[PDB]
Design a binder for this molecule. Sequence first.
Ligand SMILES: Nc1ncnc2c1ncn2[C@@H]1O[C@H](COP(=O)(O)OP(=O)(O)O)[C@@H](O)[C@H]1O
Ligand SMILES: Nc1ncnc2c1ncn2[C@@H]1O[C@H](COP(=O)(O)OP(=O)(O)O)[C@@H](O)[C@H]1O
Ligand SMILES: Nc1ncnc2c1ncn2[C@@H]1O[C@H](COP(=O)(O)OP(=O)(O)O)[C@@H](O)[C@H]1O
Ligand SMILES: C[S@](=O)(CC[C@H](N)C(=O)O)=NP(=O)(O)O
Ligand SMILES: C[S@](=O)(CC[C@H](N)C(=O)O)=NP(=O)(O)O
Ligand SMILES: [Mg+2]
Ligand SMILES: [Mg+2]
Ligand SMILES: [Mg+2]
Ligand SMILES: [Mg+2]
Ligand SMILES: [Mg+2]
Ligand SMILES: [Mg+2]
Ligand SMILES: [Mg+2]
Ligand SMILES: [Mg+2]
Lengths: 222, 443, 443
Amino acid sequence: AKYTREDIEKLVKEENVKYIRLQFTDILGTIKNVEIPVSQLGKALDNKVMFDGSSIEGFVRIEESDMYLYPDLNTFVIFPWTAEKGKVARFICDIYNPDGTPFEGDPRNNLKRILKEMEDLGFSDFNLGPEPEFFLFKLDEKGEPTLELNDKGGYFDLAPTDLGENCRRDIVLELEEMGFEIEASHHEVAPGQHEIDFKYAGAVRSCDDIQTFKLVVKTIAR
Amino acid sequence: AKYTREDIEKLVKEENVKYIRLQFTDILGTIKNVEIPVSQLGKALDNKVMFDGSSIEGFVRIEESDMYLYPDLNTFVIFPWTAEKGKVARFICDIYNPDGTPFEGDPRNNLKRILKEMEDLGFSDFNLGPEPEFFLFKLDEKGEPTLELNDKGGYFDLAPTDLGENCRRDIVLELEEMGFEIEASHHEVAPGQHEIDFKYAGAVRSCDDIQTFKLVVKTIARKHGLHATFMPKPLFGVNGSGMHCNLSLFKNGVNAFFDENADLQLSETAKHFIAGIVKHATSFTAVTNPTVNSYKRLVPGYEAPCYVAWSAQNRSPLIRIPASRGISTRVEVRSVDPAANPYLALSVLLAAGLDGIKNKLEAPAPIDRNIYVMSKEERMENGIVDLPATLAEALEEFKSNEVMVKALGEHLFEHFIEAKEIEWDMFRTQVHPWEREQYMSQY
Amino acid sequence: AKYTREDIEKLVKEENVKYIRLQFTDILGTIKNVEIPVSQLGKALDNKVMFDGSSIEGFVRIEESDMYLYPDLNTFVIFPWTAEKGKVARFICDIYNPDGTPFEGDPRNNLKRILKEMEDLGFSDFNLGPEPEFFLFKLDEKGEPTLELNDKGGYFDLAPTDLGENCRRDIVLELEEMGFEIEASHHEVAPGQHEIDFKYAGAVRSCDDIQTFKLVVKTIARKHGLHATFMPKPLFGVNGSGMHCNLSLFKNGVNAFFDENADLQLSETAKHFIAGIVKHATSFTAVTNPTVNSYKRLVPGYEAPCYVAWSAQNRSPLIRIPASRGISTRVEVRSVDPAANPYLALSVLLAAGLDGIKNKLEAPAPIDRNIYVMSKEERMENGIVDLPATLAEALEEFKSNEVMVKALGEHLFEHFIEAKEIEWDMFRTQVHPWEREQYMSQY
Ligand SMILES: Nc1ncnc2c1ncn2[C@@H]1O[C@H](COP(=O)(O)OP(=O)(O)O)[C@@H](O)[C@H]1O
Ligand SMILES: Nc1ncnc2c1ncn2[C@@H]1O[C@H](COP(=O)(O)OP(=O)(O)O)[C@@H](O)[C@H]1O
Ligand SMILES: Nc1ncnc2c1ncn2[C@@H]1O[C@H](COP(=O)(O)OP(=O)(O)O)[C@@H](O)[C@H]1O
Ligand SMILES: C[S@](=O)(CC[C@H](N)C(=O)O)=NP(=O)(O)O
Ligand SMILES: C[S@](=O)(CC[C@H](N)C(=O)O)=NP(=O)(O)O
Ligand SMILES: [Mg+2]
Ligand SMILES: [Mg+2]
Ligand SMILES: [Mg+2]
Ligand SMILES: [Mg+2]
Ligand SMILES: [Mg+2]
Ligand SMILES: [Mg+2]
Ligand SMILES: [Mg+2]
Ligand SMILES: [Mg+2]
């Protein structure tokens, strides 16, 4: 759809991507990834990059732990905060057993199944508009979180009172460079609470966006 | 021959190499080196630079100290982190005695001898793909190691949780500039644990690369305020670091382990090889796991081998055969740790697997199970043998085995055992704080 | 025939005893007790006092936990330091099951049974003279021990260098008043180490004394703001603590070990007995040195045994025969340490001794030198065997000896190995600071 193998191969050149991150989600929803140099691109596109399935919550057992990664070409995105020292592009992947059959405990794959039940009932799109709110806490000299909120502002508050204005300003900028359609940005009701909103999309793409957003938020807050 | 004298003389000019390092490995696996002004290149390429052999662990003695360094032209490499103050090219060297003859106590030379036995069995390449895991700890304000991990992340974790991402990315940059072929990098299971992988090469070049890697990891880590350690189990309760050895044989430029039409697509040769590794397993553990600490990693529940058995795609035995086939068919030996002298670990693993082949030994039934959870009685019913439980226990199995002892040779074997006996003894006579916590108020 | 129920009821009234302590010993040798007001004396003297045997190391299990206490009348003793606020008399007790039969797992009971095998061979009594050394550490402001030794004195040192005269002086006062025959008191070889000797008694009374002794030392030491410990080897490089066991067999009330017309004035029984000890030595060591730390004392150079041999007036072998003869002729077994359970150590030493006499075994030639300064060669040529070098080796040896295993009984044997196998496993998997100092930087 969006991209073909050859599109990706060409994009990778024009952008001077140096490393590819293969990412996926475990059963708890926590994003996981491995980094490979761009020279391994053909290996990843061949569904040849493997991993220890027993080292990921909710996957396979150690007796049969080998597991394969099948990147979804349509999920190609460059991480702006990495260009300066080694530009990275990520792919979100489906999980496959070593025999060629899809892994039945892959949460992203299971969602595709319920989507097929949607199709056979006549619908062509299930759209999601996620609004994942977050708090911001102050780190200490040892970069560890404390329980001190970034500010004591409330809903829709303006700076001096809202002190997360710049953080959420930088976040919004990373997302926009990564293709997000940001819709709104503000301080939420509780002290140290923030919301950034983005346009809905297809259910799978939208779950891919939630995992991408959480990552970019935590990164820029740091 | 990759490079010739003339190539190296021209590389040095057109690259402005200001200093040369002559490196080699001691018996414990420690990188050693001397640096000379590039004006001394002729002296060194004439095998004329000398050093004090009685100051390198397990080499010669003080009455006959003089020893010589003979650079191997194919290991010529430049260190990127030195270029701005004074560019440095390294040579890995072989040790020779003053009378022109190779030193029989050089770990690298020994590996070459075992590789010639391979050539006589008809094989033409022994590929090793090493995967040496390491931890990162924070330096204090005096540049010294502390006990604080660099982070509390886990397997394949992403940054905020993974904080080694930048250090790893800087390690991968130096290795890539140095010609390494990087395959992957990631946070490993325990907190502050990491792995960078790279393509397999011939036995000698792969050990050379294990040596260069440990060096480049420790250096770059230090620039980011960290201390990298390949110590096997630095902390109780979490995973230890392994140095898995992916082994394969080539014959005619083809993976002799792959058989298109055969059980698991493993050829008979692969099966005899596995039969060899299995037979001598308990015997070469002392060499593949040479520190007291090594035996604290060899305990069930941490994805480290503690029972001799093989299996496909199974991360609990001594030998996993990964699901890859074709040119990537390989026997992965998961016992080796990154404290092992890579040159001597391959010598003993090559000899074991060449034993199985040349005597067509029969491989055992694979255990397709989580060996860690299978009961005592049940694993002795399958002939499952436990690995040695301490370095002293491992040294005793090693002494008892002629083919492994021959694999090291007299000098290596005599020195290796003496050094390990000293170490074990120190350890065993120390009174540890643990003992005081357990007994000082109780008794 | 020391005290009868009527004696006890009378003493209690005349001495104005206000509470009664019923004490016993668990499988590790740890003293245990419950206290009851003197109004419950009758309940206790009727063997009706119960306890949770499921909560005492090595006894019974949770679903069968009810156990009973049977005071042994002849162990009545008043603790003087308790007389000011509420005078306390104690009784040592035997553990019984709720059906009325003795408990098979009770260490003291077990020593009785081996003593009955001594009677069957015709001996009136088995005398033990314990000398269990200890160290004094300074307490801090929280009442917790530190690693500061109370003084930096040495053997037989005088006060100011010896700052232990105060405390020992008070220990001796309590003991003399509780009825001990004290024989000597002094600073011992290592900094902060002390010895207080007391007259031998019959094995059962001697083990009761050792328990009462460790109790009184620790108490009086705390009153001087010191922590007393019987840990075998609190610190590397200085002497450990022993609990030398002076053994002897009497017959018709006469020392069976003395024979003035014999060589060394050692009788045949002595010689046979010593042969019994030497034979089972490497086998009973797990019992007489039951901790991990025990094996750190069992190194050469510290006046602790290393090697199975015996000699007169020599402090380097496993068995020393002191100069004194006549009623004092005795075999001193220096391997035992003060972490041993006194009942089980006597039980295994008696069993070994009695095997020697029963089969009239022939003693080895005494090794009349400093075993420490003998080479590996010399020792082999003399048939000198090494003691087990870790708790794990001692356990394996102990298991393969039917006569030692049977000295313990089924319940004790089985529960001992279980507890020490567990203990050893904790120790072996532990990663010690040493390992980090050695390897964390080197690798
Ligand atoms: N047809 C639709 N289906 C699903 N989501 C939609 C649709 N139209 C809009 N949305 C999304 O719903 C979300 C509403 O967010 P927001 O503007 O924060 O709402 P609220 O009014 O709750 O604050 C946005 O992500 C928006 O893109
Ligand atoms: N034929 C071969 N012989 C030896 N090693 C090989 C061969 N093919 C691949 N390898 C190596 O095996 C190693 C496997 O590393 P990795 O991919 O981390 O393994 P895993 O799947 O164990 O996590 C790599 O260094 C790889 O280059
Ligand atoms: N016949 C005997 N049997 C057992 N022990 C005895 C006998 N005679 C003396 N002893 C004891 O042996 C121990 C010797 O202690 P000590 O005088 O400190 O000996 P050493 O000479 O080892 O320093 C004392 O407890 C003493 O009562
Ligand atoms: C996560 S693992 O199976 C962890 C292995 C462990 N560190 C060890 O060998 O001690 N390593 P890999 O998947 O790279 O083979
Ligand atoms: C001074 S000594 O040989 C010191 C003995 C040492 N404590 C040990 O047995 O480990 N004891 P003793 O003379 O009382 O028999
Ligand atoms: Mg909203
Ligand atoms: Mg909201
Ligand atoms: Mg790997
Ligand atoms: Mg790994
Ligand atoms: Mg591996
Ligand atoms: Mg004494
Ligand atoms: Mg003494
Ligand atoms: Mg003594």
